[PDB]
Amino acid sequence: KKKPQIKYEEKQAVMPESAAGTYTFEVQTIDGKLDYEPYFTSSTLPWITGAPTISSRTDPNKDVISFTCLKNKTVWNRRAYIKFKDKKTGQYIKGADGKADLTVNIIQKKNENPVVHYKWVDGIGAPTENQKIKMKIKNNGIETEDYFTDPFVFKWKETADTKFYNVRKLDKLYVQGQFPSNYFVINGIRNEQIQGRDISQCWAKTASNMLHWWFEQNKDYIEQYKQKAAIEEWKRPLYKHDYIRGLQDEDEGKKSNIANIFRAYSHNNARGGYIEDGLTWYLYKRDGQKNLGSIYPGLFNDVFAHDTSPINIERCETKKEFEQLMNKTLDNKRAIGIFWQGAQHAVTCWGAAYDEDNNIICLYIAESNLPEAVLYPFGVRYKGNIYEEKNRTYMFNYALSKPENIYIDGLTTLDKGEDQWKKWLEAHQKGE
Numbered sequence: 001k002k003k004p005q006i007k008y009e010e011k012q013a014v015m016p017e018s019a020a021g022t023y024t025f026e027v028q029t030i031d032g033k034l035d036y037e038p039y040f041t042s043s044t045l046p047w048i049t050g051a052p053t054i055s056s057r058t059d060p061n062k063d064v065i066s067f068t069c070l071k072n073k074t075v076w077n078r079r080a081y082i083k084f085k086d087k088k089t090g091q092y093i094k095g096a097d098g099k100a101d102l103t104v105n106i107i108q109k110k111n112e113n114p115v116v117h118y119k120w121v122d123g124i125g126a127p128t129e130n131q132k133i134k135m136k137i138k139n140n141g142i143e144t145e146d147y148f149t150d151p152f153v154f155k156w157k158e159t160a161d162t163k164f165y166n167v168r169k170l171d172k173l174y175v176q177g178q179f180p181s182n183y184f185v186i187n188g189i190r191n192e193q194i195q196g197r198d199i200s201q202c203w204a205k206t207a208s209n210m211l212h213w214w215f216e217q218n219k220d221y222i223e224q225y226k227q228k229a230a231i232e233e234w235k236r237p238l239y240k241h242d243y244i245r246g247l248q249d250e251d252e253g254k255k256s257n258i259a260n261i262f263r264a265y266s267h268n269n270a271r272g273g274y275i276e277d278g279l280t281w282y283l284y285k286r287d288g289q290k291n292l293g294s295i296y297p298g299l300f301n302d303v304f305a306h307d308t309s310p311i312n313i314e315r316c317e318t319k320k321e322f323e324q325l326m327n328k329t330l331d332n333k334r335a336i337g338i339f340w341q342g343a344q345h346a347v348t349c350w351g352a353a354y355d356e357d358n359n360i361i362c363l364y365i366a367e368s369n370l371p372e373a374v375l376y377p378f379g380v381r382y383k384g385n386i387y388e389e390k391n392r393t394y395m396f397n398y399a400l401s402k403p404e405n406i407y408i409d410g411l412t413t414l415d416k417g418e419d420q421w422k423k424w425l426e427a428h429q430k431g432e
């Protein structure tokens, strides 16, 4: 009397649709019906209801195995694995090579009609349908005829009516032999003429974007500061922000006073810099930033001197860390710099897309290296099995063929600093 066996073609994954339901696959039963039990290799997966079962043995050549899935609301495939235990010997049944355990790969397909919602940084409004620009798929830099069709894949075009900031690197926009020869000339504080270059100033572009937002959100406090504080003479022109929308690429040097300050007076170290250094430099006096540039604005030093800094630096390396930190930042009305080592790189993030499970699926990025006057979408993905594992967050550039995985190291955030402003104002009215 031979011992029965079971076989399965492991080259074949079992791929149920995204819909909820009880799905099946077949296992071939050789020389009779082996007494075994199927098991998921992880029992704690929330999108599978219970253990798999043998739902039919009536065909002498095959068993039917059933398992039940919840609907996959996410835009990602999700994976599970079934192994088989010999009920008499207690051993796992072997696969075709006689060495590895027989393992059936389950991959539930992604939701093709997801309901997406969005969260934007406080105070910048939100894109209208006319401001959302769909994107073509590229192959080795050449655009194809196809488009990315996921609803969250769009560029947020800058118009006269939009309220985000995206200062771009002149050194990248510059077209040698087409742009004017005075393209990099800045009129400085003492009206001196300066040729400012910014090829490695992504930390400063991100800082400038966040400071434009901060000056706008705190416009009224800043007006009271100019009326009430004893302003240092040389700093008087710096107590405003100008960001002029609708300029051609050739006029980018005339677009932003804050960006121009960094470009005229800070540094362009090829190694890079840090978002938080540029933010501190602009806002209050700290010894670490003493030699960041040839001047030190430190414009509101007596508002933030001996109190909470509105600047924070937070690291993330798991999916849970990334989502908690993004949600905390967005829900607390703060602006967002994203950094990573790769040289230290930096971009600005103005919002995020979410699926119906509230996973973050896309970020909307001001990328000072990219040419268009838009925010670009960066898809968000996580290493490994998000249902089991830390799941290192990473993002990627939809605008590129074969985008490199960008492992986010952390966020640098800028708070409005309302309590510090109120205390400064209250202290003034008390000294009346």
Ligand SMILES: [Cl-]
Pocket (backbone or CB within 6 Å): 038, 039, 040, 042, 043, 050, 051, 052
């Ligand atoms: Cl199980």
Ligand SMILES: [Cl-]
Pocket (backbone or CB within 6 Å): 122, 123, 124, 125, 126
């Ligand atoms: Cl708003």
